[PDB]
Amino acid sequence: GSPEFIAKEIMSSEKVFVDVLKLLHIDFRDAVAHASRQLGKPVIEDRILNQILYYLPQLYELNRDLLKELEERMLHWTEQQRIADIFVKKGPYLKMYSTYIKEFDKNIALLDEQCKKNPGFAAVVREFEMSPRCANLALKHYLLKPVQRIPQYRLLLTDYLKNLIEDAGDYRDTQDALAVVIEVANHAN
Question: The domain spanning residue 20 has which CATH number?
Fold first, then answer.
């Protein structure tokens, strides 16, 4: 059925998106930590790294849990055809993507500055980008994914709503979830 197919695509694309958040918050951060242990001192100041990886601990925790809830829903779809309440519940936290989007250009410029002016950090970034984990895509490519994810939620939830029955089941929560994600998406303007 169309609603289940679209909900499955929300889940499957969320698996990929959470893997990007892992790449940034866990794998890249671990690479910096590894270089810092090799050197015996931080290769970059924590406060600067955390601004480059802006809100990534919060976003990783938020979407890791969103994903696991979606996975539970899709495993039990026969008995309960609902996903949108999960987005509505997490609304206050999804609003963190608004500041992520609004600060993106400044935080990418900070990444660029730090790679040009801090050679130990530049080396970690380049070696990570060339590693199989990144597959020779720049860190900025992955840091853009949260910006791109919010319009994807909008498209997917709009298609989901189109295939629901009015004022039954997940319909009203899908409307409210769409309102949350549109408010976030507008910060790209």
Answer: 1.20.900.10
